[PDB]
Amino acid sequence: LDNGLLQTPPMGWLAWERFRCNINCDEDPKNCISEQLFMEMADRMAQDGWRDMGYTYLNIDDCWIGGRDASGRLMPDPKRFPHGIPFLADYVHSLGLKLGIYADMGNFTCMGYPGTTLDKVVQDAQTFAEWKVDMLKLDGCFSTPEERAQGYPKMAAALNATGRPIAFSCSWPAYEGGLPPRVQYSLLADICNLWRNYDDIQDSWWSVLSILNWFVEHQDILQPVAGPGHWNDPDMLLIGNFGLSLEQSRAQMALWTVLAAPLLMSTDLRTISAQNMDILQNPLMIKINQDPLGIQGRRIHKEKSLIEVYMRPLSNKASALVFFSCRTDMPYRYHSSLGQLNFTGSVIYEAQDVYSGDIISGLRDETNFTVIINPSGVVMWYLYPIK
Amino acid sequence: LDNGLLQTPPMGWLAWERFRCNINCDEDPKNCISEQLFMEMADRMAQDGWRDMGYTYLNIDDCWIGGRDASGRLMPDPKRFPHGIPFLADYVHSLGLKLGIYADMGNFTCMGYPGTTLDKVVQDAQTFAEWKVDMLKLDGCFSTPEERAQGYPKMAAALNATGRPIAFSCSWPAYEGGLPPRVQYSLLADICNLWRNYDDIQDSWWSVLSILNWFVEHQDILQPVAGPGHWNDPDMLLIGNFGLSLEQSRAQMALWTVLAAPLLMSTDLRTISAQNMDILQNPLMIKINQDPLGIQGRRIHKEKSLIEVYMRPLSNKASALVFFSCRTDMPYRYHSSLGQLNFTGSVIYEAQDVYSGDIISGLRDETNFTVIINPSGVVMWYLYPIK
Ligand SMILES: *[C@@H]1O[C@H](CO)[C@@H](O[C@@H]2O[C@H](CO)[C@@H](O[C@@H]3O[C@H](CO[C@H]4O[C@H](CO)[C@@H](O)[C@H](O)[C@@H]4O)[C@@H](O)[C@H](O[C@H]4O[C@H](CO)[C@@H](O)[C@H](O)[C@@H]4O)[C@@H]3O)[C@H](O)[C@H]2NC(C)=O)[C@H](O)[C@H]1NC(C)=O
Ligand SMILES: *[C@@H]1O[C@H](CO)[C@@H](O[C@@H]2O[C@H](CO)[C@@H](O[C@@H]3O[C@H](CO[C@H]4O[C@H](CO)[C@@H](O)[C@H](O)[C@@H]4O)[C@@H](O)[C@H](O[C@H]4O[C@H](CO)[C@@H](O)[C@H](O)[C@@H]4O)[C@@H]3O)[C@H](O)[C@H]2NC(C)=O)[C@H](O)[C@H]1NC(C)=O
Ligand SMILES: *[C@@H]1O[C@H](CO[C@@H]2O[C@@H](C)[C@@H](O)[C@@H](O)[C@@H]2O)[C@@H](O[C@@H]2O[C@H](CO)[C@@H](O[C@@H]3O[C@H](CO)[C@@H](O)[C@H](O)[C@@H]3O)[C@H](O)[C@H]2NC(C)=O)[C@H](O)[C@H]1NC(C)=O
Ligand SMILES: *[C@@H]1O[C@H](CO[C@@H]2O[C@@H](C)[C@@H](O)[C@@H](O)[C@@H]2O)[C@@H](O[C@@H]2O[C@H](CO)[C@@H](O)[C@H](O)[C@H]2NC(C)=O)[C@H](O)[C@H]1NC(C)=O
Ligand SMILES: *[C@@H]1O[C@H](CO)[C@@H](O)[C@H](O)[C@H]1NC(C)=O
Ligand SMILES: *[C@@H]1O[C@H](CO)[C@@H](O)[C@H](O)[C@H]1NC(C)=O
């Protein structure tokens, strides 16, 4: 979408994965979807290094809506959001952060809350802009294909007409199978800043692998359409939650990074471990994810040893390499060379291990190297020519 | 098997899952299958509380064999086991531990090492006894159904004839689909101390789940056949390795415990985290696993919320309850009562949470209670009448 926004993938926090549709504030006041929850997460982002590292969006998902007023104007739940959305937008802005909100192109949101039907698209966009929202996620539950085909372009135009820059996240392709001929990616790039291609992520390694598999099976289609202002969205990071081991956590981070994915956390920032914080706030990882060229990476190799190699092209002739083990036995000594990974001749390279910080220098194409990769884990290199 | 052994499930350490068939001692001397590996693990077991907590077996798996001498007698790899197996057994015995070894009923072991064919069964049994081995795992790769039908009882007879008590672990049923009529569990109980019913475990939550689902699907057949001296074996514990998150590690421990499974670790005891050690050395968990009645537990409840309830009967009118979440979203508040879990009478109960140590008093059958269960995780209770 040509609105000047998201020239690099968006970084932030989204409520959905970790907190879902928890509306029981009586029994569970700390974890229910509420004004308090968002202010508390905002405080953590401001104070715990998140904002400073580039995590700027604080995004509301489903289950925020209370109803519509006599003018059809959208309202938050008055008990869970007593001060209203402008209050929250203003609070978040006061901390140098941006606020994301959620609507559904259809009769109801996926959780059954008031939907943004075709006749409400313009009014809701205007309401969101008036509230000083900075991003919109538009789901597409409880709608027909033709309603979505009209509704998503209609919303992009309505957001534009408000005059406020609002990043536009579209779940549109996910409801249509995410692939041609039903999904037109040139159209999508014109109307959206990012799009959810595929299934909701769940808190499991199986879920991460099914998403990765789908993106890799279809990378010839998906890879070229990603770029500044228009990203593929494989869904939220699971780092900090319950389903992923340490190796798996480091793996999702590295792989989302090579895919030029949004880095949208969804985890309790109040209790996040140092180890998980260290993954998400890795400066070189973020640098790679936020590379100005915005070229989505690809899987370039798959061995019978079940080691996969991903490569992302970066600025200044640099590259990112992810050595990924789909083995489920033990650490594996992966033997390779840059020549075997289709790198250009005569150039001498140097690599920094993204997780360990170690530097491997004087690598020619013919130079044999070994990387030790743990099961369901990665080794990641930031690779550059040296003179 | 009526050999006086394993009146409770065996507890110890097995090399396979974590260290596999790593024989490259030149490049990897600290992790290869060698006498050093086993000696170092023995030290850890003696010094780090493992033995004192009941972890007594230190078991060699595949890839130990060098060959057979001129008389057909098995010999360990001379380079990797320079002092020989008697020496290792002596070392292990001096630390108050027991030595397990590995053989295959067929032409070769699964990794292609010299097999214990039918004409070698007796000689190999005598060799193991002479070495002062305490346990034998007998794999069934590279054999026919008829050879296994002959060989497994042949080995049991051979072991008995040596006069040395040797715990006998049989992989026989796993090669036959693990079910009647192909598997005769009455015979297995008479000839083996434990048997691998099903697929090899791998370092993933998916692997744990597939084993659990197979054991639950067929629990009507499998639950009754387990007891003192003869156990179902759903394979090694993954705790301390790469594939399981914290919640998942706690889940496998609790679930293997209610199933009266062997507690056979397979992990690097030299680098194991305090957090993982705390799981495996939980005193109440071990007490429950090692309950004298040896009654295998069952899944008693399954709900649409994807919460499952397991129950194991214990000595002194006590029970173990495992509340298990197959959810992949967020913590779940599970509401129940002992009455809904088929507890009858006017007995008043008290429960101890096995992981937190918290005590819940005044539980009558009608009493409503709530437990908070994390995704792919458990809450475990030790439940008992109070008077
Ligand atoms: C509502 O929708 C409108 C129309 O879609 C948006 O307006 C566009 O905004 C974008 C982003 O700000 C503009 O793109 C930028 O244009 C700059 C100048 O272009 C001029 O010249 C061209 C002809 O060559 C004209 O088409 C145009 O009208 C301008 O007069 C460029 O310099 C910018 O370059 C950027 O990208 C290059 C290469 O990728 C980089 O090297 C640069 O560093 C730089 O980042 C950029 O392309 C676009 O021109 C606007 N279009 C129109 C018709 O006005 C609104 O932003 C949007 N409003 C809201 C609120 O969402
Ligand atoms: C080769 O195979 C034979 C079986 O064919 C094995 O022999 C069995 O060995 C076990 C274990 O040593 C014996 O079980 C033990 O029996 C002891 C005495 O029981 C006798 O008396 C009763 C009378 O009712 C007879 O029925 C029975 O046949 C015996 O003659 C008990 O003292 C033992 O009790 C143990 O457990 C209790 C817990 O309940 C503890 O309190 C005790 O301390 C003790 O540990 C035990 O039950 C069994 O009797 C033998 N069977 C036969 C038919 O002889 C060989 O062991 C095996 N050889 C090898 C090397 O593998
Ligand atoms: C999106 O929502 C519209 C608007 O209807 C509203 O939402 C519905 C879920 C109901 O709660 C309505 O009370 C409410 O006004 C839906 O259009 C309407 O759907 C209803 C119910 O399906 C239709 O009524 C039915 O008519 C048929 C045929 O005569 C009867 O068999 C049924 O017994 C029932 O009376 C109604 O005609 C229709 N209205 C219009 C103007 O089209 C729409 O279905 C829904 N779309 C999707 C894709 O979810
Ligand atoms: C276990 O091994 C026996 C022994 O034969 C060996 O394997 C043969 C395939 C061949 O490589 C010989 O040099 C080895 O000595 C197998 O029994 C043989 O099976 C083959 C069928 O492939 C048959 O032609 C021979 O008559 C058999 N030999 C004898 C003397 O019995 C047996 O098949 C192997 N079992 C399994 C299931 O792997
Ligand atoms: C890399 O190692 C291989 C052995 O697998 C060897 O054949 C080859 O010569 C080495 N590459 C070079 C040119 O250094
Ligand atoms: C237990 O809770 C249910 C509601 O979940 C209620 O209907 C029932 O009366 C309660 N029983 C007792 C003994 O409090």
Task: Describe the 3D structure.
The structure is a homodimer of 387-residue chains. Chain A has 2 domains: 1-290, TIM Barrel, CATH 3.20.20; 297-387, Golgi alpha-mannosidase II (Immunoglobulin-like), CATH 2.60.40. In chain A, helix 2 (35-47) runs parallel beside helix 4. In chain A, strand 3 and strand 4 form a beta hairpin. The first copy, chain A, is of the alpha/beta class and 387 residues long. Chain A is built from 13 helices and 18 strands. The first copy, chain A, is 30% helix and 23% strand. In chain A, strands 9-8-7-6-5-2-1-10 form an 8-stranded parallel β-sheet. In chain A, strands 11-12-13-18-15-16 form a 6-stranded antiparallel β-sheet, with helices on one face. In chain A, strands 3-4 form a two-stranded antiparallel sheet. Chain A binds chain B through residues 17-20, 22, 27-28, 31, 202-207, 241-248, 328-331, 333, 374-377, and chain B through 17-20, 22, 27-28, 31, 202-207, 241-248, 328-331, 333, 374-377. Bound molecules: a molecule of 5 linked components (NAG-NAG-BMA-MAN-MAN) (2 copies), a molecule of 4 linked components (NAG-NAG-BMA-FUC), a molecule of 3 linked components (NAG-NAG-FUC) and 2-acetamido-2-deoxy-beta-D-glucopyranose (2 copies). The site of a molecule of 4 linked components (NAG-NAG-BMA-FUC) has 4 residues of chain A, from loops.
